[PDB]
Design a protein around this nucleic acid. Structure first.
Lengths: 239, 200, 192, 117, 205, 205, 117
RNA sequence: ACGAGAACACGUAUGCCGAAGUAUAUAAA
């Protein structure tokens, strides 16, 4: 997922080796589509970095407090157990956007499933009132142009992990960050607390590579009644 | 609770650029490094004595102190001034203090987190306001909060209403007059909002 | 597999107080308009519908913490001021929140210590959306009977704090039920 | 017509206000204004009742009577354009304009009450 | 699990001053600009007087301890044994019948009675003015009672009968000893709004 | 606590002029536009007289801190003491018998009385117009007594009957010196409206 | 309506008011009208009792007496159509119309008082 | 086959308490 504002679309920072501050670029995470090729070719200046950071108000964070009175407060004198949730709210013209590719039939199926999903959630406490959405499919000329270039490097836009037999030649010259991705599973065995996916590491969403690798949908499964899938397949941006 | 984070603004350059063209040996950058280190590893210990604060993670250019609300503000001002003394007003600090409720997971409060604030807000407006409420009782959180209710909605009809409210109060003419004159001006009224919020 | 949508608006008959800030009331940190959380609706509805009697409580809201796992079948979202309430209050120049002054009386002493509690204004309207994931065809009648009885109970109860002291009474108007996924008919299901 | 609302500060002479106006002498007017403010506020439509038109006529009657009783009230009413605005509000008969007059009059009253001997 | 609704009207005998705003105005709804009786007022006065009915020793007064069954009716849930409240007192709102009445006959919704104070050794008077709700006003109230225990309905309604009757001989609001704020209840009603309980044998005078 | 009611009637002997609302009008209700005697007036007058009957030093007068037993009877709760009032006075309302009587004898409710002042060494008059409640009219009152303790009820009603006698030979209202304000008391009735106390041996003249 | 308004400005001549009308000259009429006001207000129904009709008859008699006593009062009553209005009020026997007359006459008096020597 | 899934910022308490719209003010001519 990658955020947007009113009419500006955003992609992550390529972890590319720029030779000059080493400060203003560090505080920056995302670079809009207008100036992306400029960033890749050094046409971005420190004052421009400050300005782009200044314009990047695309949502704010919050902690909402809650209490849980299912406990013995039903029964007898017993303290409430306040808990906290973390939320994000977008301004009336923000959101997130996807990029998907495949056969036309696959994209028709994806449309059907997305229509199903818009009334379910896409987050955490879905059932408690968080995270519904309405979606629109728009074709932006500039993002298409950016996606359909041809170059020598590659910018990994998703989270991937090469299969066993390609990693040695995949990591020849690269700049990357790994992230322990964990979490529980939904309806696998009796106890949710006793079921927890094995930890998985994958490259982040900004890494740069020389040699492309295809990914695979890796099982993180064990001690279960059905396989549980994790996703690792790259969407490459070639410039 | 109070939490404070501070970074030296001109530290990348100071470490790197340093003193140009004539004092750039290993020796002189080394002594500068030692001076900053010893400042953040002794002087904080001494400066924090009169304050109800425990020191969490301090050194390099990171200042992470947590304690009582009022105390964090007072200690932050004291530390900023004492630093400007030791750096001879060459290096500046940027700092943020927020109010966080007790028993929050501290992992979450951390990810949330000068002359103007000292002279204009704390010293003048806060002092006259504290004296005003100290002299005249019955001005509980209700009266102050009605003042807020009028102020935050920046409208002229609200200015008339605030005039009525101050007229119905029993403060001295000087206090009411100063409050109303401040209320007429945008910068002053924001500062007044901040000061009275600090009063509570 | 179809998804039923239960949408409508709720009126604040007597002042409302959710007060996550406390004693402020929950708001949105930018719009500065009050909201009524989904957690509040769901919690009070669950407590009422359970105290009414269990397996049905597990079925509608889902517990999945008792050695067996059931997925929630009713999703409740937050509510917000409608455009209608906003425009009406703007034209007639009515603030969005009332503040009630309160007081307490000590015994053997009769000194009064006052309070300050904020309350959402009478007549305000909130727009809500519920979702019903029909995972079993042969139970939709029963489950909407249960949700009917729950809404009927909430009509005669309070939301938020201090309801015994006289606030939180709400009303439900303009409920429509539409099928938004799948090919299940919903022209017979009913909610007041 | 807001200069008519801040004329009150232009009328602090030397010290008496409006030549000795006190809000205490405005009490009957304030009571009547509050009464019909509540009654209008509960009303649904913009078109006022004909009985409400007669009520506004009763407002002008009371304003003239008070201006007759006290000279300071007379100056207050005459120079702040109270009579023409009352007539105009009677002329448009719309609720929102009556509320507009109510806000103007209440602002007058409160701001005047700010300064009193 | 059933809930019983209690409905009626409150008729103001002598002027009433709740007046939580503090000149000295009365509480008013911000949608109608009309006086209201907050439900906390009803609950608190019933609490206090029906408490003072039964045992209320100095130790009970200091620790805010009360009688077991008044506590049952109104809930404590502070310490010891938590008893969730059982009678929900709502607010009361200015009725439309009396609104039509006073609009038609052109009667103000509020009087401002002026009062005085004759201090001693000086005999110098210092005035004050108080707003008070006009008599003949009618407020519409609703109570809800929850049946957490079936066998206790009779005793609980007996006690709330005590509460109504005792309140009719007392005041709401301030200046109660100065004449203000005596109320009466009229046209009561009992009806089962949720459940499978009969409410015919019930009465409230 | 039981509550003992006192009901009766004020007979207007000579004119009565409260005039809190002010040519110089009197206090009037707004639901009937017929005059009333505010309860605050009655309570203040009785408190002043009954205080004066007991001891009253310049210090008692200095801060309205009065003799302990009158304080008990009317409540202070100021000097760190727990004293809510034990005697409630309501307002008095133009009675129905009076209205019918004056209707069927064609007599007005209010007299407009013209007064002058004669300046010294000047002999020039400056006139005044004072409006007063007509004579012989009757208003009805109701009082409420609370029994916070059993063993002061007889003594407290002895005090109240003394006070009523003092009022029967004093003026209530404005300028009794200049002529108006004598009243009398008739038709005292004593009931215990809520409780289990007897109201047979207790009397007020 | 407020014909009183423009009539009172029509009767300002050269200065005399209604050929010298003064507020002291209408005291008795004001008193009688006020008493009838309060009595009728005490009444519940809209139908006027025969006793109140007799009160209106005596009120008409009193207008005629005062108009015979002084010439300026006669001109005031004549031009302000007091006599035709009273005749119509007696014909109608409705309480609301009597209260409307009360309001009209009060406006007349208030204007006459506000414009004085 | 979503770092998930169970989870009412709930319970107790009111605008209270003492305060007189008072003091003079020949209904002259």
């Amino acid at each position: 997922t990658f955020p947007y504002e009113n009419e500006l679309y955003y992609l992550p920072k390529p972890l590319i080796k720029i030779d000059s501050n080493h400060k203003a670029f560090k505080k920056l995470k995302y670079v809009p589509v207008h100036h992306y090729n400029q960033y890749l070719n050094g046409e971005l200046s420190a004052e421009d970095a400050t300005d782009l950071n200044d314009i990047f108000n695309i949502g704010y964070f919050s902690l909402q407090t809650k209490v849980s009175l299912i406990a013995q407060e039903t029964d007898s004198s017993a303290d409430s157990e306040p808990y906290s949730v973390g939320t994000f709210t977008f301004e009336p013209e923000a959101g997130l956007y996807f990029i998907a590719k495949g056969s036309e039939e696959t994209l028709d199926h994806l449309n059907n499933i997305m229509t199903a999903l818009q009334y379910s959630g896409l987050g955490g406490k879905r059932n408690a009132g968080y995270g519904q959405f309405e979606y629109e499919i728009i074709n932006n000329q500039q993002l298409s142009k950016l996606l359909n270039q041809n170059g020598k490097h590659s910018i990994l836009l998703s989270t991937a992990m090469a299969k066993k037999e390609e990693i040695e030649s995949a990591l020849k010259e690269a700049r990357y960050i790994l992230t322990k991705r964990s979490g529980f599973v939904q309806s696998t065995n009796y106890s949710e607390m006793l079921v927890k996916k094995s930890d998985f590491y994958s490259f982040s969403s900004g890494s740069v590579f020389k040699n492309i690798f295809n990914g695979d949908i890796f099982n993180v499964g064990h001690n279960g009644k059905h396989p549980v899938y994790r996703y690792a397949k790259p969407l490459w941006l070639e410039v | 609770l109070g939490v404070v984070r501070a970074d030296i603004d001109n530290l990348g350059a100071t470490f790197i650029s340093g003193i140009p063209e004539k004092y750039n040996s290993i020796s002189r950058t080394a002594t500068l490094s030692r001076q900053l280190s010893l400042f953040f590893k002794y002087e904080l210990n001494h400066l924090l004595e009169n304050y109800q604060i425990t020191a969490i993670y301090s050194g390099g250019d990171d200042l992470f102190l947590i304690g009582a609300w009022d105390d964090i503000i007072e200690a932050s001002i004291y530390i900023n001034d004492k630093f400007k003394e030791f750096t001879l007003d060459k290096l500046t600090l940027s700092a943020g203090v927020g109010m966080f409720s007790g028993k929050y997971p501290v992992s979450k409060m951390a990810f949330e987190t000068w002359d103007e604030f000292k002279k204009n807000i704390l010293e003048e407006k806060l002092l006259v306001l504290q004296q005003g409420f100290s002299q005249t009782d019955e001005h509980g959180k209700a009266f102050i909060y009605k003042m807020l209710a009028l102020l935050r909605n920046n409208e002229a009809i609200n200015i008339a209403r605030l005039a009525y409210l101050l007229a119905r109060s029993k403060m001295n003419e000087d206090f009411t007059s100063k409050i109303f004159n401040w209320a007429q001006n945008d910068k002053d009224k924001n500062q007044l909002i901040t000061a009275l919020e600090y009063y509570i | 597999y179809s998804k039923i949508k239960i949408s409508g608006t709720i009126e604040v008959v007597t002042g409302l107080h959710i007060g996550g800030g406390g004693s402020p009331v929950v708001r949105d940190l930018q719009t500065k308009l009050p909201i009524i959380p989904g957690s509040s609706i769901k919690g009070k509805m669950r407590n009422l519908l359970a105290k009414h009697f269990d397996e049905r409580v597990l079925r509608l809201f889902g517990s999945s913490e008792k050695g067996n796992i059931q997925r929630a079948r009713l999703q409740i979202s937050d509510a917000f001021f409608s455009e209608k309430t906003k425009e009406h209050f703007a034209q007639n120049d009515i603030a969005y929140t009332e503040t009630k002054f309160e007081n307490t009386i000590n015994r053997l002493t009769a000194v009064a210590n006052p309070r300050q509690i904020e309350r959402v204004t009478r007549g305000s309207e909130f727009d809500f959306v519920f979702i019903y994931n029909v995972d079993e065809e042969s139970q939709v009648e029963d489950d909407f009977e249960n949700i009917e009885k729950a809404i009927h109970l909430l009509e005669n109860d309070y939301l938020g704090g201090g309801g015994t002291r006289g606030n939180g009474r709400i009303q439900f108007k303009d409920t429509n039920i539409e099928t938004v996924v799948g090919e299940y008919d919903s022209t017979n299901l009913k909610i007041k | 017509m807001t200069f008519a609302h801040e004329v009150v500060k232009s009328n602090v002479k030397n010290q008496v206000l409006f030549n000795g106006l006190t809000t205490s002498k405005l009490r009957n007017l304030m009571e009547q204004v509050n009464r019909l403010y509540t009654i209008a506020f509960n009303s649904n439509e913009d078109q006022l009742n004909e009985e409400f038109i007669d009520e506004l006529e009763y407002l002008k009657i009371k304003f003239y009577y008070e201006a007759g009783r006290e000279k300071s009230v007379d100056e207050f009413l005459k120079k702040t354009l109270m009579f023409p605005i009352i007539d105009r509000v009677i002329k448009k008969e719309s609720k929102k304009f009556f509320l507009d007059y109510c806000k103007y009059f209440e602002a007058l009253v409160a701001y005047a009450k700010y300064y009193q001997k």
